């Protein structure tokens, strides 16, 4: 997350931290995700497409630090890793960048709600907030595009939804942005998601309720002028989410 502020998991209690285990070596952070029901985390396919092997991923909920424990956190294995069959990224855009992780603890349990662990509501079908409204993003991604290091503490910032008409201008992204995506950025291009934030949530108030409007997907650099963050538009994937979580 470029700009914004350090936060606690209490303020983003749906946030899932996803790591990869390397047999014979290290554990590395991969991506964020969002708890949509006790047993299901939603993330981005491009986080996993190169190595779609459920056994080597680890999911935490209630976790606000990258390399230490948070009181009340839960650690999960991935019982099922579901990627979108029409994911592609032959050009700049990532299409259908959405994934599901069924989570199961060592003792065989799903997530247990608390002050630090909570589901986030899905939007109603095709229901998005209006352009020019504020949304929150969160993650353990880079603080500057060219950093080698990552923040130790979870961050969040606020970005604004940008119209497709604006985002599809040639000097923005042209036809790379589709109606299955949403653009969001800072009016002054000072804050954005960045590498390490994919899979995490774009959270907007909708029908009285914090709602998973988007999933962090892609962009040209991070916080660059006329290059918004691009987010999977969740309200266009409800049937996919419903049929794969059954």
């Amino acid at each position: 997350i470029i700009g914004g502020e350090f936060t606690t998991i209490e303020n983003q209690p749906w946030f899932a931290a996803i790591y990869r285990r390397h047999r014979g070596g290290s554990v590395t952070y991969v991506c964020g995700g969002s708890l949509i029901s006790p047993c299901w985390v939603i993330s981005a396919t491009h986080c996993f497409i190169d190595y779609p092997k459920k056994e080597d991923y680890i999911v935490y909920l209630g976790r606000s630090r990258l390399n230490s424990n948070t009181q009340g956190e839960m650690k999960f294995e991935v019982e099922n890793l579901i990627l979108h069959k029409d994911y592609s990224a032959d050009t700049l855009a990532h299409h259908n960048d959405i994934a599901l992780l069924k989570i199961r603890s060592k003792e065989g349990r799903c997530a247990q709600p608390s002050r630090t662990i909570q589901t986030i509501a899905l939007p109603s079908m095709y229901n998005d907030p209006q352009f020019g409204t504020s949304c929150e993003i969160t993650g353990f991604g880079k603080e500057q595009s060219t950093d080698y290091l990552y923040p130790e503490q979870l961050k969040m910032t606020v970005v604004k939804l940008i119209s497709h008409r604006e985002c599809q201008q040639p000097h923005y992204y042209g036809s790379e942005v589709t109606t299955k995506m949403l653009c969001a950025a800072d009016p002054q291009w000072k804050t954005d998601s960045c590498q390490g934030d994919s899979g995490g949530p774009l959270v907007c108030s909708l029908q009285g309720r914090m709602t998973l409007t988007g999933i962090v997907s892609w962009g040209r650099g991070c916080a660059l002028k006329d290059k918004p963050g691009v987010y999977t538009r969740v309200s266009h994937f409800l049937p996919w989410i419903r049929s794969h979580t059954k």
Partner: nanobody
Amino acid sequence: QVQLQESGGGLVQAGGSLRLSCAASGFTLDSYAIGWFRQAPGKEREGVSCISASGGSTNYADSVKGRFTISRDNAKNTVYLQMNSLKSEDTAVYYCAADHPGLCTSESGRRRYLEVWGQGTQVTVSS
């Protein structure tokens, strides 16, 4: 503790062959896109070759295409650069790199990338 380490460099005669190795530790390079770069005296760094995460495709810079081959051995957790028909202009420090945006992989995805570099191996081709 992810790292890469190059080996195999040295002095070779023009027209000859050389194989460089890039050995990973702390991770397995089998599911990451890997590449080789080089930097010759007084010149900027140049991409040489890369292999995709799946291993289904490889790419070559104009200056080495048709002469160099990149490959990956998952049993040895090592990537190779086979350099045939060497020329004096191939004299450089060679570096391998794993999981960087744009290196045989997307440059727009916002997942975390390892962005690992090796330390270099010197290749000198005498004509």
